[PDB]
Amino acid sequence: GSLTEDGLSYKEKFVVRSYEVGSNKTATVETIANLLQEVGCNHAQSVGFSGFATTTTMRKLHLIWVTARMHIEIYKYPAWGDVVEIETWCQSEGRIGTRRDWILKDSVTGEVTGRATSKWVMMNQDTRRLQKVSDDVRDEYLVFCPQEPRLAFPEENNRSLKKIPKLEDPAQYSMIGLKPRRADLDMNQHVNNVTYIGWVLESIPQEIVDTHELQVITLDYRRECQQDDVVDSLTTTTSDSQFLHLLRLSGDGQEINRGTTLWRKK
Amino acid sequence: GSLTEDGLSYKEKFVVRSYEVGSNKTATVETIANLLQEVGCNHAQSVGFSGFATTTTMRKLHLIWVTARMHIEIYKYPAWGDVVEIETWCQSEGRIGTRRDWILKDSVTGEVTGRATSKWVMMNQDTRRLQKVSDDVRDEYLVFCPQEPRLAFPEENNRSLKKIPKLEDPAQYSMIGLKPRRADLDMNQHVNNVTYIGWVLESIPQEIVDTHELQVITLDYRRECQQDDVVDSLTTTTSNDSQFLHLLRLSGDGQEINRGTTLWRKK
Ligand SMILES: CCNc1ccc(C)nn1
Ligand SMILES: CCNc1ccc(C)nn1
Structure with a gap:
C-alpha cells in the first residue's frame, strides 16, 4: 500500500480470502465496505493521522469524523483468490464536511469493477452535536486533498446524491x-x-x-x-x-x- | 503464501487490518481463528484439493471433513499494522481422522506468538453420519503429510487433549x-x-x-x-x-x- 506519485491519493492490493466470499465464490458487499474502510485508514495513517483522520485541533477539541452517507456501486464482485486494487482520496466540501471517494479495479485487466463515495460530518465525541467545521481545522487536512474536483460519481444528478424517503409501516x-x-x-x-x-x-x-x-x-x-x-x-x-x-x-x-x-x- | 522447501507444510504472511483489532489495538481471537482457516484453505489449494480438502473419493461419496475440536493458545496478539507469519500442516491420525496444526510467529523477531491444533473427522454431508477413514481416501492425502510426528502441542500432559465436562444449570x-x-x-x-x-x-x-x-x-x-x-x-x-x-x-x-x-x- 502506498500514496500515489503526487501524494494526493492512496492505493492498496487485497487478495480475496475464503471467508470473505458468498455462495457464488465472490466477495460479499460487506467484505468490500470493510476493504474501503481499511484503505481509508491506511491513507490517513500514511499522511500523519495516528481516531480516524482526527487532526491535531480535533483531538484537543474532542471532535470526530462520523459517516453521514455511504454509496457503493459494484459491476463485478472479485472472485476468491483474485487481487483487487482500490484507490482512495479525500476532498473538502466547505463547511458541510469531507467527501471520501474510491475506485475499485481488477488487478489483472485494470478495468474498474466498482466505485464508492461517502459523505462525512464532524461531531463532538461527548455529545452528538453536529458542527459546521472551523477554518483552522480545514487548513490542516486540505494539504492532503486534490484542489481540482475529482469525483467517483461525477454525473450531475446521479444516484449518490438522491434524497431517500422513510419506509411506511407495514413493511413487506x-x-x-x-x-x-x-x-x-x-x-x-x-x-x-x-x-x-x-x-x-x-x-x-x-x-x-x-x-x-x-x-x-x-x-x-x-x-x-x-x-x-x-x-x-x-x-x-x-x-x-x-x-x-x-x-x-x-x-x-x-x-x-x-x-x-x-x-x-x- | 507458499509451501515450504519439502512441500509438507505451508506459510503465509498477514498484515493486521484496522477492523480486525479489539479495544487494545491487537487482533481479536476471532481474527486469529479466521487467519488459521484462510492459511488452511490455501495449503489445501496449493496441493490439489479445490469442499475443504475433499479428495476425489470424498467427492463422489459425498464425504466432508468437519471440525470436531479446535485448541488455540496465544502468547502475544499481533498489533494493528504488524505482520504475522503462520505455518500450517496436516497429519493422519489413523481411522479417527486428520489433525491440522499451526504455529503463529512474529515476522520481525521470528518469535512464536501462539499455536493451534484442530482435530477433524470424516462425515457424510447428506445424512450427517460420522465414519472412520478408509484406506483409499487416506492414501490420497497421506502424501501431503509429514510421516515423522510433528505436533504443535507435543507435551506429555497438555491442555489440547483434556476431556471437557457439560455446564450444569444454572450458569453464572x-x-x-x-x-x-x-x-x-x-x-x-x-x-x-x-x-x-x-x-x-x-x-x-x-x-x-x-x-x-x-x-x-x-x-x-x-x-x-x-x-x-x-x-x-x-x-x-x-x-492470578x-x-x-x-x-x-x-x-x-x-x-x-x-x-x-x-x-x-x-x-
Ligand atoms: C486524507 C486524510 N484526511 C481525511 C479527512 C477526513 C476524512 C473523512 N478522510 N480523510
Ligand atoms: C493437504 C490437505 N489435506 C487435508 C486433509 C484433511 C484436513 C483437515 N486438512 N488437510
Whole structure:
C-alpha cells in the first residue's frame, strides 16, 4: 500500500480470502465496505493521522469524523483468490464536511469493477452535536486533498446524491431482534459502519440473494446503535429489483438508518 | 503464501487490518481463528484439493471433513499494522481422522506468538453420519503429510487433549437469543466455525475482557447451528488467572451444539 506519485491519493492490493466470499465464490458487499474502510485508514495513517483522520485541533477539541452517507456501486464482485486494487482520496466540501471517494479495479485487466463515495460530518465525541467545521481545522487536512474536483460519481444528478424517503409501516419483509456482538465493534468499542449494511441486507428475501446480485447500495446514517441496543431491519419492494430500507431500534422505534438497494438478475 | 522447501507444510504472511483489532489495538481471537482457516484453505489449494480438502473419493461419496475440536493458545496478539507469519500442516491420525496444526510467529523477531491444533473427522454431508477413514481416501492425502510426528502441542500432559465436562444449570453468566446473519455463513451456506468462538465469548463479562487477555481456548464441536436456529451461550467461572466453562445450546429444545473452556491472565 502506498500514496500515489503526487501524494494526493492512496492505493492498496487485497487478495480475496475464503471467508470473505458468498455462495457464488465472490466477495460479499460487506467484505468490500470493510476493504474501503481499511484503505481509508491506511491513507490517513500514511499522511500523519495516528481516531480516524482526527487532526491535531480535533483531538484537543474532542471532535470526530462520523459517516453521514455511504454509496457503493459494484459491476463485478472479485472472485476468491483474485487481487483487487482500490484507490482512495479525500476532498473538502466547505463547511458541510469531507467527501471520501474510491475506485475499485481488477488487478489483472485494470478495468474498474466498482466505485464508492461517502459523505462525512464532524461531531463532538461527548455529545452528538453536529458542527459546521472551523477554518483552522480545514487548513490542516486540505494539504492532503486534490484542489481540482475529482469525483467517483461525477454525473450531475446521479444516484449518490438522491434524497431517500422513510419506509411506511407495514413493511413487506422484516428481520427483527438483531443484536451486535463484540466482532461487530471497532477498536473504540462503537458499532462498525459495515454492520449496518449487513443488517439492512438481512431483511432481503433469500430468493433475491440467490437469483440476483447487489448492484447499488446507498445508506444514510442518522444515529448510532449502542452495544446493548436491539435492531429491526425493514424492507419493501419499490419496483431489476429495487428496495426501500429502514433500520430502527426494536423498542421505541427510533430511526438509525435508511436506504435503497438495486439488484440485477444473475 | 507458499509451501515450504519439502512441500509438507505451508506459510503465509498477514498484515493486521484496522477492523480486525479489539479495544487494545491487537487482533481479536476471532481474527486469529479466521487467519488459521484462510492459511488452511490455501495449503489445501496449493496441493490439489479445490469442499475443504475433499479428495476425489470424498467427492463422489459425498464425504466432508468437519471440525470436531479446535485448541488455540496465544502468547502475544499481533498489533494493528504488524505482520504475522503462520505455518500450517496436516497429519493422519489413523481411522479417527486428520489433525491440522499451526504455529503463529512474529515476522520481525521470528518469535512464536501462539499455536493451534484442530482435530477433524470424516462425515457424510447428506445424512450427517460420522465414519472412520478408509484406506483409499487416506492414501490420497497421506502424501501431503509429514510421516515423522510433528505436533504443535507435543507435551506429555497438555491442555489440547483434556476431556471437557457439560455446564450444569444454572450458569453464572449467559447471552441469550443469538442468531447468525449472512456474514456468519461460509460459501456453502453453513455457519462458519469462527462464529461459534464469538458466541462462546459473548457470555464472558465485559469486566473480564477489559482487565484480562484470552490465553487458551478449547472448543469441542458436536452439532452445527442452522441459518434459522437461535443460540444460548452459557458461562460459569471454575477458578492470578481466570478459568471458565462454556456451553452453546439451541434456545428452543436446549440441544447441545458446543462445549469448551477458556483461560485468561491479568493484563
Ligand atoms: C486524507 C486524510 N484526511 C481525511 C479527512 C477526513 C476524512 C473523512 N478522510 N480523510
Ligand atoms: C493437504 C490437505 N489435506 C487435508 C486433509 C484433511 C484436513 C483437515 N486438512 N488437510
